[PDB]
Ligand binder design. Structure first.
Ligand SMILES: Cc1cc2nc3c(=O)[nH]c(=O)nc-3n(C[C@H](O)[C@H](O)[C@H](O)COP(=O)(O)OP(=O)(O)OC[C@H]3O[C@@H](n4cnc5c(N)ncnc54)[C@H](O)[C@@H]3O)c2cc1C
Ligand SMILES: NC(=O)c1ccc[n+]([C@@H]2O[C@H](COP(=O)([O-])OP(=O)(O)OC[C@H]3O[C@@H](n4cnc5c(N)ncnc54)[C@H](O)[C@@H]3O)[C@@H](O)[C@H]2O)c1
Ligand SMILES: OCc1ccc2c(c1)CCO2
Ligand SMILES: [Mg+2]
Lengths: 1213, 107, 54
């Protein structure tokens, strides 16, 4: 039995002093990075004046010769949308291979009318064309606007404009965005500029392999290109002759630090094989630089290759370093030293960097200390110049390659390098179809007589458009954008970034408009911090902390107010290896559970008397303690709950965020009149064993209620540690009692007479048992015991033919198989538009087979075990039923080491219809359905028809499809162009409807109000909108003479927050929306006419329809309703036949309420949030029925970086 | 249509053009339910016309028009109300219903 | 362009024939100019061979 964490994340090699200096700079504060860069980039006044003059001369040349798209827009008087739509049409026409067929379709069918008449929106790539036409990036496509614009332009201008559009798109896609469609075509087209002194580096456009097959395809593309380039080079060598550029992410589908062993074992030999071929032809082979978390891993490959004797005698190995990265100078020190050690003159391409907006978003999402890139553009410019000074001092051992389109940058380096030049000393580089105008003012004896290597993309239209958005960001801070801006003077363009930065008041200050990850929420609260699992220092420190956590004697005991209690004790075993004993739990007797509730009741006044601010301070102290203890908590979660390190980090962050969010919400709301319910029983699930556990308890406690915490029987240890932390933070033992044990302990707590409320997260079937238990019960005031029941999902993602397959597959793999599918939010049903289903399914299966399943105390493990053998048995019984029906079943092969634990292989099951699924299958089982585009609305109905409503995902670029699907789907958490497992507290307030929840949402602003007797007004909770059916009902009431009720109806219309529509602060590159909608059909059980009118007013004011109990005999009270109100009103004799309902309002005395509550609990399907009031209460209290619980919260999280870049951050420089 | 607005000229030609900015990403939900009903009974041509009407309808258009500072000038397309349908044939009725429902109207 | 250049004369006629004040006569002529230019622009944005006149 391997020791826990003994092999957690060993580095590829021991970290040298030079490598450690790189890692130390990873997220170094920007004010610390800049001063040495300013010093290194300083040049003499004479040089700065000479450089400014050269830059002015170059810019004057550029501006004096400055269009294709612009000229077309001008000639045909196109609007921007027409220009975009035209280019989309041209793109589609160019997918017709035969020219005569295309020209006939244009002449006879497209021009003559309905272009629509001739499975994929024309506008799938309109975001890219929008960038070409308008210079602005939109994340999604207004396809209805484009369709209108295309019809308009064709009807106005006919075949001539189509012809011009086709010819323009053909030129741009075949000659500008790429040098050629194939390496042979690109090589033929390179001779013209090679004759003038340029060279080439060809990019076959491979990137981000998703499957082994993709990686093999990119490999053979590189290999075939090397042959073609080497044959054409014909002995010109690595400096005069052409070379190739490769991306390591193209060559392996798991290129990441977590998979370092596979990278060195499987990716490295492939690079070596390509390098051996480049060596034989004596051409350059350059490794392009990618995301910041791949930099240091790529150094391990560079090190091995440069030390490999089989590659000796060849100086063509090249490597990019990104000057926007804080590690750049230290990376260069490492490379220069590696060049000296190996004797290889490494070709070093210095760039600024291509992933800036993505790096900002990633660091914010991950809660990391700082960014790995600079946040002010001028800082990157200084960094670049400083790094060029370092490279220019080392030309004997490296070959510097200064890739830039910025004439100021170029001029600074040209003069820094001095007058002594020979080919091979250094070169400039530029991008094909972008940098030639500048470098035609550089290359050649008549210019600056310095060589330039043209980075030359090669590939088809399909391949080029994939990442063209990134390549065009053309941002407001970009030189190429600024050179074309008339409002930007040459003096502004030749400004010396070194001297500008040196003179700033604080050298190197962070950009004012970019939040550090800790500051995403500003003054409201401090964001939780994560850990960087690509940082070798973090991995080394975490390894020790994780090992130390496995040496702790973890226990969970019944922690009553009087002290620990005795009980039945058993071990807690690691689900991934039952030989690994994690700890011991002493379970609570039913007698002690009842005793704990009595003690909580006796202690309730003392805890309610702690002012809300001090209760919130306890939560904040607990969050600080959890943040400090995160590494130890990770180890416990990893071993107890089968979680990977990444998912354990998220778990602890979520707990911290719950604590701080509920603390802040308390500070915003709770006052003396918001009295606690009393003892609250918090029953939590195993699968989020710290986060949901902490969230429910923290909310109840901060609302002033003592808590009986009943954690899932599978995961008592992390719960006990959370309770220990909360108690250390100041929660008294009488206010927070931990009662470990199984459902019997939960049920005994629910049934205890002093239990004043229940917070349950778990399966729908168990919640239904709790609902039945509580139906017998009333509070001492004779009102129902509040139940928050957050339950299962049957979560779907819909993917149309406009989605990017690689993006979909990544989000599907994560959503379906992260945590072995043991998230309530996990993707269960993937719905693929028929035209793309086969391609996506092939990619998904390929990606499935790249997952590593095993015991989770290894960083390389992607998918851990299922929690118990019974869970495994239940999941496998479902898989076998599906397989026994003939459904296609794809499963990863499990390693023999999984035999010591309970594992289920990630599984894809292809279904015929969504009705093939019965209940939630809480495991790593993805079901796949295919749909025809015209059946999209029916499909949404089918998703809704399960009765669940938790998470839902949509992958599309098309606004029409987003509007349609999001308006028709009924789920609590929607996700657009991203995974569906987001539950960021206060950002995606989480919780569903139907079989998935009663609400209110955890991590949202209505939550605390459910845990007090009189709900406060949440922050931002109001709406200026008034339901029009409510207004019609109020007028009807006045016409009937029910004057007081009409006034109450008008008051309800105003008080309702239906229509609230907010954007919640969060990370860049995402829009997180929070909206209040109607719940659905509310069951009304009135006793009196006035009670019915009040119930109807409450329900209509919140947008709902109603089913009114026909047994009330109140039919004559609703005669002559306006048709608008009648449409919302039904009468129900058999409540179970007329559901599902979304809530209920009950009027009556205590025993009537009890009887009605029992009847409601017996209704099939969803748990109903029931509110009851007596007739006298309705008369006395305008809020007898609280409108908070008659609306439904919906959270929507939209990935606005999905088109390939961040539009909002294009303005941030 | 309104004078001084983008629908006006289209009334004065025998085939109306698509006015500038005249589109909507919203699809009337009753139109969608009608299209599904049509597909259920195999009225394939009519269901297609219904979906096409749902898409080409500009119901829900909501624009701010350029104007002076200190003013917001909004232009929105709503349903007309209740449309009188005088069909002759079943297919004609389905096409009329599709047009009226796609634009948010009752009939 | 002609109505704009001749606005002062047109104002005099509108003031005397239709009972308008100077300010409202200005608004009248401006609106006529705006209709002319707006329908001209809308035409340039939309009308093609298939949009036959009534
Ligand atoms: C031949 C060639 C090869 C390249 N290879 C790679 C590669 O392998 N990997 C890679 O990542 N990039 C690579 N690039 C660079 C990247 O694609 C951009 O072209 C480059 O960063 C643009 O810089 P520029 O100096 O031409 O222009 P500039 O307009 O001077 O610089 C723009 C750059 O500034 C940076 N920037 C913008 N805003 C900010 C901000 N707020 N804070 C900090 N920095 C900011 C970004 O890096 C941005 O790209 C390559 C570029 C060329 C020409
Ligand atoms: N909607 C959400 O936010 C959310 C979040 C996480 C998990 N879930 C759901 O939780 C489920 C998985 O967690 P689980 O397996 O631990 O759930 P579960 O229903 O098995 O158990 C949940 C809790 O209820 C207790 N319990 C069991 N029987 C009881 C009874 N008769 N009376 C009182 N308490 C009883 C258990 O001991 C445990 O603490 C899944 O269905 C999942 O979808 C929902
Ligand atoms: O657009 C110029 C460019 C070249 C190579 C490369 C990138 C950009 C990103 C990663 O690899
Ligand atoms: Mg269970």
């Amino acid at each position: 039995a391997p020791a826990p964490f003994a092999d957690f994340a060993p580095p590829v090699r021991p970290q040298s002093t030079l490598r450690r200096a790189i890692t130390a700079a990873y997220r170094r504060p920007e004010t610390e990075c800049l001063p040495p860069l300013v010093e290194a980039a300083t040049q003499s006044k004479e040089i700065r004046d000479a450089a400014a003059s050269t830059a002015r001369k170059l810019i004057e040349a550029l501006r004096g010769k400055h269009s294709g798209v612009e000229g077309l827009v001008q000639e045909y008087s196109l609007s921007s949308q027409e220009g975009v739509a035209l280019m989309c049409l041209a793109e589609a026409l160019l997918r017709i291979p035969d020219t005569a067929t295309r020209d006939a379709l244009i002449r006879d069918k497209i021009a003559d009318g309905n272009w629509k008449s001739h499975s994929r929106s024309l506008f799938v790539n309109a975001a890219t064309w929008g960038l070409v036409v308008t210079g602005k990036l939109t994340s999604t496509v207004n396809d209805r606007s484009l369709a209108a614009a295309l019809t308009r332009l064709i009807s106005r201008c006919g075949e001539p404009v189509i012809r011009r559009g086709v010819d323009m798109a053909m030129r741009m896609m075949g000659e500008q965005f790429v040098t050629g469609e194939t390496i042979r075509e690109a090589l033929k087209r390179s001779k013209e500029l090679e004759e003038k002194g340029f060279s080439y580096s060809y990019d076959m456009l491979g990137e981000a392999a998703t499957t082994a097959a993709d990686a093999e395809r990119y490999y053979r593309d590189y290999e075939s290109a090397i042959h073609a380039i080497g044959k054409a080079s014909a002995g010109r060598g690595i400096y005069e002759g052409p070379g190739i550029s490769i991306k390591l992410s193209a060559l392996h589908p798991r290129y990441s630090r977590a998979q370092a062993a596979r990278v060195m074992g499987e990716l490295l030999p492939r690079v070596k094989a390509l390098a051996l071929l480049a060596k034989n032809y004596d051409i350059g082979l350059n490794i392009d630089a990618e995301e910041a978390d791949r930099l240091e891993l790529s150094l391990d490959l560079l090190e091995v290759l440069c030390l490999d004797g089989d590659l000796s005698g060849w100086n063509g190995m090249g490597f990019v370093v990104q000057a926007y990265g804080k590690r750049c100078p230290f990376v260069l020190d490492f490379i220069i030293d590696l060049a000296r050690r190996s004797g290889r003159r490494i070709m070093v391409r210095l760039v600024k960097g291509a992933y800036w907006d993505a790096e900002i978003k990633r660091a914010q999402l991950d809660g990391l200390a700082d960014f790995p890139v600079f946040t002010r553009k001028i800082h990157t410019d200084v960094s670049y110049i400083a790094c060029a000074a370092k490279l220019l001092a080392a030309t004997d051992v490296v070959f510097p390659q200064f890739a830039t389109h910025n004439a100021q940058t170029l001029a600074a380096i040209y003069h820094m390098a001095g007058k002594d030049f020979h080919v091979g000393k250094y070169e400039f580089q530029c991008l094909h179809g972008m940098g030639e105008p500048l470098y035609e003012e550089v290359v050649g004896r008549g210019k600056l007589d310095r060589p330039c290597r043209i980075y030359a993309p090669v590939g088809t239209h399909e391949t080029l458009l994939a990442y063209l958005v990134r390549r065009l960001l053309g941002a407001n801070s970009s030189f190429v954008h600024r050179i074309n801006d008339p409002k930007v003077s040459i003096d502004e363009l030749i400004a010396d970034p070194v001297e500008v930065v040196r003179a700033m008041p604080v050298v190197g200050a962070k950009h004012d408009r970019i939040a550090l990850p800790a500051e995403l929420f500003g003054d409201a609260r401090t964001n939780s911090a994560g850990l960087d699992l690509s940082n070798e220092e973090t991995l080394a420190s975490l390894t020790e902390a994780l090992r130390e956590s496995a040496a702790m004697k973890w226990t969970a005991l019944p922690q009553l107010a009087t002290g620990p209690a005795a009980g039945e004790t058993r071990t807690v075993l690691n689900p991934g290896d039952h030989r690994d004993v994690v700890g011991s739990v002493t379970e609570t007797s039913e007698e002690d559970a009842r005793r704990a509730v009595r003690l909580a009741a006796d202690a309730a006044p003392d805890w309610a008397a702690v002012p809300p601010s001090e209760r919130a301070a306890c939560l904040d102290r607990a969050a600080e303690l959890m943040q400090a203890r995160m590494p130890t908590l990770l180890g416990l979660i990893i071993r107890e709950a089968g979680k990977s390190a990444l998912n354990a980090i998220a778990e602890v962050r979520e707990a911290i965020d719950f604590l701080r969010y509920y603390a802040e919400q308390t500070r915003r709301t709770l006052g003396p009149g918001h009295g606690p319910l009393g003892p609250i029983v918090c029953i939590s699930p195993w699968n989020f064993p710290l986060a949901i556990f902490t969230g429910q308890i923290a909310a109840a406690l901060v609302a002033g209620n003592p808590v009986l915490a009943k954690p899932a029987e599978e995961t008592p240890l992390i719960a006990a540690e959370g309770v220990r932390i909360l108690r250390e933070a100041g929660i008294p033992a009488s206010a927070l009692q931990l009662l470990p044990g199984d459902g019997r302990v939960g049920a005994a707590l629910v049934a205890a007479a002093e239990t004043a409320g229940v917070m349950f997260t778990g399966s729908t079937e168990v919640a239904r048992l709790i609902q039945a238990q509580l139906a017998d019960r009333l509070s001492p005031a004779g009102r129902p015991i509040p139940l928050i029941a957050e339950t299962g999902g049957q979560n779907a993602m819909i993917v149309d033919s406009s989605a990017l397959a690689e993006q979909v597959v990544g989000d599907v793999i994560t959503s379906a198989f992260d945590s072995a599918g043991q998230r309530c939010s996990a993707l269960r049903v993937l719905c693929l538009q028929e035209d793309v289903a086969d391609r996506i399914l092939t990619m998904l299966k390929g990606a499935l087979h790249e997952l590593h399943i095993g015991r989770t105390d290894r960083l390389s493990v992607d998918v851990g075990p299922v929690i118990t053998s019974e869970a495994k048995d239940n999941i496998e019984k479902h898989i076998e039923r599906m397989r026994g029906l003939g459904r296609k079943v794809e499963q990863i092969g499990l390693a023999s080491e999984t035999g010591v634990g309970t594992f289920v292989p990630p599984t894809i099951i292809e279904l015929e219809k969504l009705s093939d699924l019965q209940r939630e299958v809480f495991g790593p089982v993805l079901h796949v359905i295919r749909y025809r585009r015209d059946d999209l609305d029916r499909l949404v109905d089918d998703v809704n028809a399960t009765g669940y409503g938790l998470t839902f995902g949509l992958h599309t670029r098309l606004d029409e499809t987003i509007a349609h699907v999001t308006s028709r789907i009924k789920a609590g958490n929607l996700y657009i162009n991203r995974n569906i497992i987001g539950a960021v507290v206060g950002v995606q307030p989480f919780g569903g409807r139907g079989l998935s929840g009663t609400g209110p949402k955890a991590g949202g602003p209505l939550y605390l109000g459910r845990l007090v007797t009189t709900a406060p007004v949440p922050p931002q909770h109001s709406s200026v909108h008034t339901d029009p059916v409510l207004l019609d009902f109020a007028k009807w009431l006045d016409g009937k003479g029910a004057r007081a009720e009409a006034e109450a109806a008008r008051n309800a219309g105003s008080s309702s927050a239906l229509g609230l529509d907010l954007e919640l602060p969060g990370p860049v590159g995402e829009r997180n929306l929070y909206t209040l909608h109607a719940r659905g059909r509310i069951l009304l059980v009135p006793a009196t006419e006035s009670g019915l009118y009040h119930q109807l007013a409450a329900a209509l004011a919140t947008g709902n329809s109603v089913a009114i109990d026909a047994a009330s005999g109140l039919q004559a009270s609703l005669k002559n309703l306006p048709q608008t109100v009648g449409l919302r009103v039904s009468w129900s004799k058999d409540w179970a036949a007329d559901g599902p309902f979304a809530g209920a309002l009950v009027e009556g005395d205590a025993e009537r309420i009890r009887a009605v509550n029992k009847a409601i609990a017996a209704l099939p399907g969803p748990l109903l949030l029931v509110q009851a009031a007596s007739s006298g209460e309705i008369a006395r209290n305008p809020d007898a029925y609280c409108l908070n619980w008659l609306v439904e919260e919906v959270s929507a999280s939209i990935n606005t970086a999905a088109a390939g870049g961040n539009a909002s951050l294009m303005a941030i420089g």
